[PDB]
Design an enzyme around this catalytic site. Structure first.
Site, PDB file in Angstrom:
ATOM      1  N   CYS C  91       0.803  -1.218   0.000  1.00 27.23           N
ATOM      2  CA  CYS C  91       0.000   0.000   0.000  1.00 27.23           C
ATOM      3  C   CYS C  91       0.838   1.272   0.000  1.00 27.23           C
ATOM      4  O   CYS C  91       0.325   2.334  -0.371  1.00 27.23           O
ATOM      5  CB  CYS C  91      -0.938  -0.005   1.206  1.00 27.23           C
ATOM      6  SG  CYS C  91      -1.763  -1.589   1.489  1.00 27.23           S
ATOM      7  N   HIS C 351      -8.736   3.718  -3.125  1.00 23.38           N
ATOM      8  CA  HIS C 351      -7.389   3.326  -2.708  1.00 23.38           C
ATOM      9  C   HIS C 351      -6.740   2.538  -3.840  1.00 23.38           C
ATOM     10  O   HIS C 351      -6.674   1.302  -3.795  1.00 23.38           O
ATOM     11  CB  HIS C 351      -7.441   2.511  -1.412  1.00 23.38           C
ATOM     12  CG  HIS C 351      -6.112   1.992  -0.953  1.00 23.38           C
ATOM     13  ND1 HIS C 351      -4.912   2.507  -1.393  1.00 23.38           N
ATOM     14  CD2 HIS C 351      -5.798   0.999  -0.087  1.00 23.38           C
ATOM     15  CE1 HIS C 351      -3.917   1.856  -0.819  1.00 23.38           C
ATOM     16  NE2 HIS C 351      -4.427   0.935  -0.022  1.00 23.38           N
ATOM     17  N   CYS C 381      -0.693   2.382   6.162  1.00 24.08           N
ATOM     18  CA  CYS C 381      -0.507   1.020   6.635  1.00 24.08           C
ATOM     19  C   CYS C 381      -0.258   0.095   5.449  1.00 24.08           C
ATOM     20  O   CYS C 381      -0.564   0.421   4.301  1.00 24.08           O
ATOM     21  CB  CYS C 381      -1.722   0.549   7.437  1.00 24.08           C
ATOM     22  SG  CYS C 381      -3.296   0.640   6.551  1.00 24.08           S
TER      23      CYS C 381
END
Ligand code: VWI
Ligand code: VWI
Ligand code: VWI
Ligand code: VWI
Lengths: 727, 397, 395
Positions: C91, C351, C381
Site C-alpha cells: 500500500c 485506494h 498502513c
C-alpha cells in the site's frame, strides 16, 4: 441509452411485418437509392424498429432481417464521413455508439435473429449480419461479403472488429477479414465462418430463415438468441491476450505489421490491431466502446479523407464515363492482334484472353511467339494448383492465343496493340506492314512509354484510329491503362479503347499528347531524386528505406534497374537534343551524372545482369558493395523525412505541371493514374490530393504544401519551387 | 553527500542451469532465505532490528516471485517485522539498482543498515511471464519501434564490425577465465551452496559453465518470424543487412540464482562489530537509443567516473555483464578498456544471467577480486532494455 | 546535504470498480496523461535533466508488467536517459517511490526525478501477481497469513470500536471529500482523463457517495479459516467483531499520480517554483497477522528524526484503508479530530494501491498552501505489517 440520434426529419427505410407465428421480418428498402446504406435514415429507421421489438417482445418469437434491393447492405455515407473535422469527434463517437447500441439490443433480445443475405453485404452491411445469431446467404453471381473499410482508411466501427475477434480470435480475425478488407464470395464466406448456410435462390432466404427460427426454438430453447460470447463458458478462439499461448507471439504482431507496411504512414491497420487486442481484454460492451474511439480517430484524420476521395469519389467518376466521350456509341471487338511477345505483349495477350477475346500474337519467329504464349501458360499452371480456375476454363483460355510469326495471320483483326521496341521508325515500319491486312474499322494502338502519338501516327493511312494504349508490366497485375490522345485522334476511338479497358478489368485515364505523357514523366522525377541523392553522397540503404517508408511499392534504386539505365540515358540524349538544336540551353539534371557513371562501369540494370543491386540466378541479391565507394556514400546524411519528402514532392509538383499544361484534364485521373499506374502511395490519395490534403509538422493543406516545398527549395534546389497555380 | 555507505557482506548462490537444472525444484523465496541464514551464520550476535529494509531486484515478479518477494523473505526468515521489504524492477540492472538504492538510502541519513540484492528463478518464472505494459498495447509497441535485446546486439556487431569469430573469441575467453577462477578458489567464500530442508546438498557450483569450450565448438552453433529486423532497419536506415552473429554460446545463459549485499553506514558497522569490505564511491544512470537497446552502459560509465572525479586509468577492474559478446566488445573498444581488467573472472556467458540478481552477483564478484589482488578500485555496470544503464564504482577498504 | 523539494504533484480522478469510467483505459495511458500535463505546465523543461521515473505498482502483471515506469518513459517520448523503475511495497508503493526519489536527490547522484504510482484495479485485480504466500503452503502455514480485512476487524475488537463508531468515520470522510470537491480544493491537482480524440472520459472521483446517511451505512453487510488463524496468535480475545463493510473500507478504484522532485539547484536551473520541502522519511512496522499496525511506530520515528512532536504538525493524512485503522491511529498519537484527513480519504474516493501514497502526498501539498500552513505528516498502513511516513514543509 437511446436508440436514436437526437435525444424536418429523416425518411423511413425499414418495413415491418409480423407473421402469425410471432416472427418479425425487417425488410430494408431505402427509397433514396437502389442500395441500402448506412445514413441518417437507416439509423433513425432501425431505431424505431428496435424500439418496437422491445415494446412488443411479448408477442414476438423471432426476427428476420432482409433487404428488398439487389444487394443486402453496402457501406455508409461517404459524402458525410469525408467532412468529419477533428472538432466533430464527439458526434462521430456518439453516432457509432448509437449504431452499435441498436445492434446490441437486437443481438440480446432473447429470441433468434437471422440475416437473409440476398446480395452483397459489405462493411456496415456485414456488421448488421454479424449482430444476428444466424446468417443465410444466397449463392448468386455478384454477391460479396466483407469488411473493406480499411481500404478507405477507416475500420469496421459498427462492431465488425469487436465481433470478428469474438468469432475467430485476434489473429485470424485480423489477418483474414479485417486488416485487408477482404471481400468473399458466399461459398468462401461459409468456409471461413462469416456465413452459416447457403441456398440456391433468393426466394428461399426468408422461408429458410423462419424454418431455422422454428427449429432453433424447438431444439435449442435455452441458448436461442444467445451469441457464443454471451454465455458463461465463453472461450475466445486462439485465446485472450492473458492466455500464455497468445502472449508469447502477441508482442510480435505490431512488428510483423510494421514489416508488411514497410514503415509507411498508414494508420488504419495500426488502429484495427489496437482495437482488436484492447477489445479482447475486456467485456463485449467495453470492447465495443474502444472500437468507437479508434473509429473516430480515423474518420477525423487526413489519410482517411485522402483514401475516401481517391478510392470512392475519384474512382466512381472515372468508371462512370467521366473522361469518356459522351455522344459516342459502342463498337464490340471480335479478334485482337498483339505485335510483339515480350513481357509486355505476352501479358497483353493474357489479359485480353482472360476476358474472353480471341488474340493473335505475332513476333519475328514462331520460336519467340510460342514463348510469348508460354507467359500465359505459367500464369495458368499456377492458377490451377492454387485453385482459382478450372481445367476446362484454363484450356479455353490458352486456346484463344494463337501464336504466329506470319503477318498474314492478322486478317480479321479489329483491335491492334503494338508492343515492340521504342523506335519511331520501327513502329512506322510495323504499322505500315499491318494496316492493310487488318479491318478497315480497326483500332491501331501503340503501347508507348515516351514517344508522342502524333509523330507515330504519320506512318499509317487512317490516323483517326491511331491511339496510344499504354500498359504497365506485368500486365496481369497492373490495373491502369493510360490512353493518350494524339492530335489526329478521334473521339470515337477514345471510347472504343475506353470500353476495351473496362472489358479486360482495368481502369482508364485520358491523357493529351506530350512527351512523357503523365505516368512516365512523373515517375521520372521520382527516380531522378533518388539518383541525385546517391550522387550527393546519401547512403544507398537510406535511399531505399526512404522510398519504402514513403509508401511506394518498389524502392527507387530497385525500380531503376527494372527500368534499365540504358533507356534512361537515351531519354536524356533526346531531351538534350530537342532543346540544343531548337535554339536554347539545356540544364542537365544532376541524376544524369549518376546514370552515365553506372553505364561506364558496365552496370546498366537488371536486363544486362547488374545494376544498383546484384542478380545471382534470376532473383535479386543485395546492393552492389562497390556502390558506396563509387559515390562516396556517407558524406551526406540528410534527415530521412527530407529524403522521403523530396521523392513525394518531385512527383506532386510534376503532377501539378501536367494539370497546368493540359496533359491531364481532371484531378481524378491525376490521382488514380498516379496510384494505379506508377505506384504513388495510396495513403496520399494521389499526387494531386497530396497537395490539398498535405499534413506535416508545419501545418495542413495547400498552404502547408507550399511552405514545405519552399523549405526544400532553400536546401536542395530550385526544382522544389511551387508553380504560380498553387500560389 | 552526507553519510558514506560501505559494503559489509556480498554473497550469492550458485547459478543452476535452465534445462534439467538443479535449482529448478527450489522456490526462489528459498534461495533468498538461504542467503539470509548465511548472514546470520557469519554474524550470530547482530541485532537484526537495525536492518531497516530489504531491497530485492526482480524482473518477473509473478507467481513464485510475486507479492513483494522481499517482504516474504523478511517474514519467512523470521527477520524483525520492522525490516520492511520492497521489490523493484529496472530490468537487467535490478540487482545493481537495489544495491545503489540501498547505498543512496544510507547516504540520505534516514536509513542505517539495509540488505540489498536480487532473485530470479528463470527455470520456474521465464522471462516475459509478467506480460508487459507494451506487449499487450499494440498501439504503443507500434510507435516505440520495439526490437528485442538479441537483435540489437546483432546490430551492434554489424555496425562496429564484430565478426562471428570475434564474438565467439570472447565467449571462449569468458569460459576460460571463469574455470580458472573456480579452480583457484576465488569464489569459495561467496558462493553459498543451496541445501534442502534436511541439509542435503542441491548445488554448489555454477553448472551452466562449459569449461571445455573450443573455438570449433562455438563455430558449429546456429544463430538464434517476428519482423524485428525490418523494424530495426527502419530506424537505422543506413544499414542494409543485419549480421546475426549471436548464438546460445556467445550470449548470457538462462539460470536460477540469488544474491545478497549488506550495506550500511560506518556507525552501523562499528556498532555491530562489522568489518567494511569496500565503499560505494558513486552511482549513475543513463542510456542511448531504445531500438539498439544495449548501448546504455557507455554514458552511464562516463557519468559515474565524472561524478567520482576519476578516469579510465584509475579503475583497476572493469566488470560489465555479459548479456551479449558484442556489447562487451563495443564497451571495450569505445572506452579502450585493457583486456586484463575486463571481467577477469568470467561472466554471464559462462555462469549465467539471473536477471534480477545479476547486478548484485557481479558486484560481490569485484568486492572479492579487489581483496584477492589487493587492488583499489572497480567499476560495475550493466546494459538494460529500452537503452538503460546503471554503473557503480567501489573502492576497497 | 542536498535538500529535496516538491515542484509538482498531480493525480488522476479515481474511477470505480463496477462499471467504472477508467476500465477501458490502460494503466500505462493514465501515467502518460499525467506526463503530458507536466509538460503543459512547463513546456520549456529540459527533460534530459530528469534522471529517473519511479512508479509504485502492487500488481505488476499484464497491463502493469514489464516495468511500467520504463514504458511511461518511452511511450510519452521522454529521453531514453530518464530511467524508469517499478517498485512494490504494497500500500505504500506510492509514498515509497516519492521517498526513494527524495533520498536519491539528497545523495547528490540524482538531480530531477519523477515519482508516483499507478494501479488499474478494475483491469488488474489485486492478487493477479500471485505471491509467495499462496503458492507456498509451507511459508503461509508458518507466517500465519491473515488478510488485512480481518486485522482491521480485530483492531476494532481490541480497541472497542463499535460498528457505529467506524460508520461514523465513514460518513465523516464522505462529507469532507464532498466539501473539498465543491470547494474547488482539487481543481488544480486532479487532471481529467481524455481519450485519443480529446473526448472526456472522467473528471471526478466517482466512487464517492456524497449523499451517505448513517442509516444507510448500518444497512450494509460485513465483508476460509482466517478468523481462527488470527485468534491463535491473539489468544486473549474470544471473538472477532466484524465491523467493516464496503461503506467504511477503502474503495477499489483505478488511478495514477505523479510527483516532480528535485534539488534547489535543479529547480532554479529549470525555472521551477518549489511548493514544499520533504523534511524526513521513515519506515517501520508491527505484527504481521493484525497486519495494518505499523504506521504508529513509523510516524513516531519520522517525528523523532525531524525533532518534532504531534503539536508541531498542522495536518495529519493517513490512508483510509479501514476505518478502525484511522481511529486507532487517532487514539494512540492523540490526533485532534479537525487535523486528520481534512479533505476526505480512500473510503470516499478510493485506494488505488500503487498510487495512493502519491495521491495523499499531493493532497497535503495543496491543503498546506490553501490554508497557508507549515507542516503535514503523511503515512500509510501496509500488508505484511509495514508502514512508511513522510513530513513535508511548505515553501
Ligand atoms: O454514415 N454515417 O456515418 C452517418 C453519420 C451521421 C449521420 S447524421 O448524424 O447526420 O444523421 C449520418 C450518417
Ligand atoms: O459516424 N460518422 O461517420 C460521422 C461522420 C460525420 C459526422 S458529422 O460531420 O455530421 O459530425 C457524424 C458522424
Ligand atoms: O462497394 N464498395 O466498394 C464499398 C467500399 C467500402 C465500403 S465501407 O468502407 O463503407 O464499408 C462499402 C462498400
Ligand atoms: O525514367 N526516367 O528516368 C525518365 C526520365 C525522363 C522522362 S521524360 O523526359 O519523358 O519526362 C521519362 C522517364
Amino acid at each position: 441509452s437511446s436508440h436514436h440520434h437526437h435525444h424536418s426529419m429523416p425518411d423511413n427505410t425499414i418495413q415491418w411485418d409480423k407473421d402469425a407465428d410471432g416472427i418479425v421480418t425487417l425488410t430494408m428498402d431505402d427509397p433514396s437509392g437502389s442500395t441500402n446504406v448506412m445514413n441518417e435514415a437507416y439509423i433513425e429507421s432501425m431505431g424505431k424498429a428496435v424500439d418496437r421489438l422491445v415494446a412488443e417482445k411479448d408477442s414476438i418469437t423471432g426476427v428476420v432481417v432482409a433487404s428488398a434491393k439487389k444487394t443486402f447492405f453496402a457501406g455508409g455515407d461517404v459524402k458525410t464521413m469525408i467532412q468529419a473535422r477533428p472538432e466533430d469527434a464527439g458526434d462521430v463517437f456518439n453516432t457509432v455508439e448509437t449504431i452499435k447500441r441498436q445492434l446490441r439490443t437486437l443481438e440480446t433480445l432473447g429470441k433468434p435473429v437471422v440475416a437473409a443475405i440476398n446480395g452483397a453485404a459489405l462493411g456496415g452491411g456485414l456488421e448488421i449480419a454479424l449482430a444476428c445469431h444466424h446468417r443465410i446467404a444466397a449463392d448468386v453471381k455478384g454477391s460479396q461479403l466483407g469488411l473493406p473499410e480499411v481500404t478507405l482508411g477507416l475500420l469496421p466501427g459498427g462492431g465488425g472488429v469487436t465481433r470478428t475477434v469474438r468469432m475467430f480470435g485476434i489473429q485470424n480475425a485480423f489477418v483474414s477479414v479485417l486488416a485487408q478488407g477482404t471481400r468473399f464470395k458466399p461459398a468462401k464466406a461459409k468456409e471461413i465462418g462469416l456465413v452459416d448456410e447457403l441456398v440456391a435462390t433468393v426466394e428461399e432466404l426468408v422461408p429458410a430463415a423462419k424454418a431455422w427460427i422454428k427449429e432453433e426454438l424447438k431444439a435449442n430453447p435455452d441458448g436461442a438468441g444467445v451469441q457464443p460470447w454471451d454465455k458463461k463458458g465463453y472461450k475466445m478462439p486462439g485465446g485472450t491476450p492473458s492466455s500464455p499461448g497468445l502472449a508469447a507471439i502477441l508482442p510480435s504482431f505490431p512488428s510483423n505489421l510494421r514489416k508488411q507496411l514497410k514503415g509507411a504512414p498508414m494508420p488504419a491497420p495500426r488502429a484495427i490491431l489496437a482495437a482488436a487486442v484492447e477489445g479482447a481484454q475486456v467485456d463485449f460492451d467495453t470492447a465495443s466502446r474502444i472500437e468507437s474511439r479508434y473509429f473516430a480517430s480515423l474518420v477525423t484524420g487526413q489519410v482517411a479523407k485522402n483514401m475516401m476521395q481517391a478510392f470512392f469519389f475519384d474512382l466512381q467518376a472515372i468508371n462512370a464515363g467521366g473522361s469518356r466521350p459522351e455522344g459516342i456509341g459502342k463498337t464490340p471487338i471480335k479478334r485482337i492482334g498483339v505485335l510483339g511477345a515480350g513481357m509486355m505483349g505476352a501479358g497483353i495477350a493474357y489479359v485480353s484472353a482472360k476476358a474472353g477475346y480471341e488474340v493473335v500474337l505475332k513476333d519475328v519467329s514462331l520460336e519467340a511467339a510460342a514463348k510469348g504464349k508460354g507467359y500465359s501458360e505459367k500464369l495458368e499452371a499456377k492458377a490451377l494448383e492454387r485453385g482459382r480456375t478450372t481445367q476446362e476454363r484454363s484450356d479455353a483460355l490458352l486456346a484463344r492465343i494463337t501464336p504466329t510469326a506470319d503477318a498474314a495471320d492478322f486478317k480479321g483483326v479489329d483491335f491492334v496493340i503494338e508492343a515492340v521496341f521504342e523506335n519511331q521508325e520501327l513502329k512506322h515500319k510495323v504499322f505500315g506492314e499491318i494496316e492493310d491486312i487488318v479491318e478497315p474499322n480497326a483500332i491501331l494502338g501503340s503501347n508507348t512509354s515516351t514517344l508522342p502519338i502524333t509523330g507515330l501516327a504519320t506512318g499509317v493511312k487512317r490516323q483517326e484510329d491511331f491511339i496510344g494504349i499504354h500498359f504497365f508490366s506485368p500486365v496481369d497485375k497492373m490495373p491502369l491503362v493510360e490512353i493518350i490522345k494524339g492530335e489526329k485522334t478521334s473521339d470515337e476511338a477514345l471510347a472504343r479503347v475506353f470500353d476495351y479497358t473496362l472489358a479486360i478489368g482495368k481502369t482508364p485515364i485520358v491523357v493529351n499528347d506530350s512527351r512523357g505523357f503523365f505516368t512516365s514523366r512523373v515517375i521520372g522525377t521520382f527516380v531522378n531524386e533518388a539518383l541525385a541523392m546517391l550522387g550527393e553522397g546519401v547512403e544507398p540503404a537510406s535511399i531505399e528505406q526512404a522510398g519504402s517508408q514513403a509508401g511506394y511499392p518498389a524502392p527507387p534504386l530497385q525500380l531503376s534497374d527494372e527500368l534499365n539505365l540504358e533507356l534512361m540515358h537515351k531519354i536524356a540524349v533526346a531531351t538534350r537534343k530537342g532543346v540544343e538544336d531548337a535554339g536554347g540551353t539545356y540544364q542537365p539534371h544532376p541524376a544524369e551524372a549518376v546514370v552515365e557513371k553506372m553505364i561506364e562501369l558496365g552496370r546498366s540494370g537488371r536486363l544486362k545482369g547488374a545494376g544498383f543491386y546484384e542478380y545471382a540466378d534470376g532473383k535479386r541479391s543485395g546492393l552492389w558493395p562497390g556502390l558506396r565507394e563509387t559515390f562516396k556514400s556517407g558524406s551526406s546524411q540528410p534527415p530521412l523525412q527530407d529524403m522521403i519528402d523530396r521523392m513525394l514532392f518531385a512527383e506532386a509538383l510534376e503532377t501539378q505541371k501536367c494539370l497546368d499544361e493540359g496533359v491531364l484534364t481532371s484531378t481524378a485521373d491525376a490521382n488514380i493514374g498516379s496510384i494505379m499506374g506508377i505506384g504513388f502511395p495510396p495513403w496520399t490519395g494521389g499526387s494531386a490530393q497530396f497537395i490539398v490534403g498535405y499534413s506535416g509538422p508545419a501545418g495542413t493543406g495547400k498552404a502547408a504544401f507550399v511552405a514545405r516545398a519552399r523549405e526544400l527549395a532553400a536546401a536542395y534546389g530550385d526544382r522544389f519551387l511551387p508553380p504560380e497555380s498553387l500560389l | 553527500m552526507s553519510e558514506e555507505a560501505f559494503i559489509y557482506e556480498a554473497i550469492r548462490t550458485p547459478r543452476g542451469k535452465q534445462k534439467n537444472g538443479s535449482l529448478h525444484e527450489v522456490k526462489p523465496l528459498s534461495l533468498v532465505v538461504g542467503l539470509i541464514d548465511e548472514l546470520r551464520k557469519r554474524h550470530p550476535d547482530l541485532d537484526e532490528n537495525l536492518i531497516s529494509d530489504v531491497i530485492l531486484g526482480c524482473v518477473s515478479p509473478v507467481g513464485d516471485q510475486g507479492g513483494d518477494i522481499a517482504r516474504a523473505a523478511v517474514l519467512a526468515s523470521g527477520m524483525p517485522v520492522t525490516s520492511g521489504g520492497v521489490q523493484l524492477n529496472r530490468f537487467c540492472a535490478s540487482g545493481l539498482e537495489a544495491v545503489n538504492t540501498a547505498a543512496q538510502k544510507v547516504r540520505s541519513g534516514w536509513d542505517d543498515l539495509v540488505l540489498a540484492g536480487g532473485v530470479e528463478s528463470m527455470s520456474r518464472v521465464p522471462m516475459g511471464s509478467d506480460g508487459g505494459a507494451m506487449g499487450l498495447d499494440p498501439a504503443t509497441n507500434y510507435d516505440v519501434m520495439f526490437v528485442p535485446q538479441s537483435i540489437g546486439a546483432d546490430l551492434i556487431a554489424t555496425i562496429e564490425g564484430f565478426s562471428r569469430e570475434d564474438v565467439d573469441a570472447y565467449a571462449l575467453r569468458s569460459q576460460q577465465k571463469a574455470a580458472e577462477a573456480w579452480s583457484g578458489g576465488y569464489f569459495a567464500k561467496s558462493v553459498v551452496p543451496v541445501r534442502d530442508q534436511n541439509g542435503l546438498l542441491i548445488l554448489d557450483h555454477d553448472e551452466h559453465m562449459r569449461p571445455d569450450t573450443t573455438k570449433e565448438g562455438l563455430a558449429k552453433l546456429k544463430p538464434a518470424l517476428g519482423g524485428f529486423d525490418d523494424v530495426a532497419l527502419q530506424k537505422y536506415h543506413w544499414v542494409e543487412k543485419i549480421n546475426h552473429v549471436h548464438t546460445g554460446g556467445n550470449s548470457s545463459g538462462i539460470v536460477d540464482g540469488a544474491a545478497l549485499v549488506m550495506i550500511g553506514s560506518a556507525a552501523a558497522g562499528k556498532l555491530q562489530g562489522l568489518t567494511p569490505r569496500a565503499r560505494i564511491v558513486a552511482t549513475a544512470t543513463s542510456g542511448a537509443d531504445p531500438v539498439i537497446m544495449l548501448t546504455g552502459p557507455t554514458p552511464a560509465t562516463r557519468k559515474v567516473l565524472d561524478r567520482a572525479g576519476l578516469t579510465v586509468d584509475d579503475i583497476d577492474l572493469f566488470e560489465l555483464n555479459e548479456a551479449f559478446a558484442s556489447v562487451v566488445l563495443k564497451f571495450q573498444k569505445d572506452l579502450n578498456i585493457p583486456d586484463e581488467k575486463l571481467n577477469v573472472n568470467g561472466g554471464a556467458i559462462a555462469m549465467g544471467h539471473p536477471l534480477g540478481a545479476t547486478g548484485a552477483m557481479i558486484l560481490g564478484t569485484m568486492v572479492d577480486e579487489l581483496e584477492r589482488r589487493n587492488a583499489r578500485r572497480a567499476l560495475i555496470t550493466l546494459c538494460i532494455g529500452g537503452g538503460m544503464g546503471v554503473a557503480t564504482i567501489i573502492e576497497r577498504v
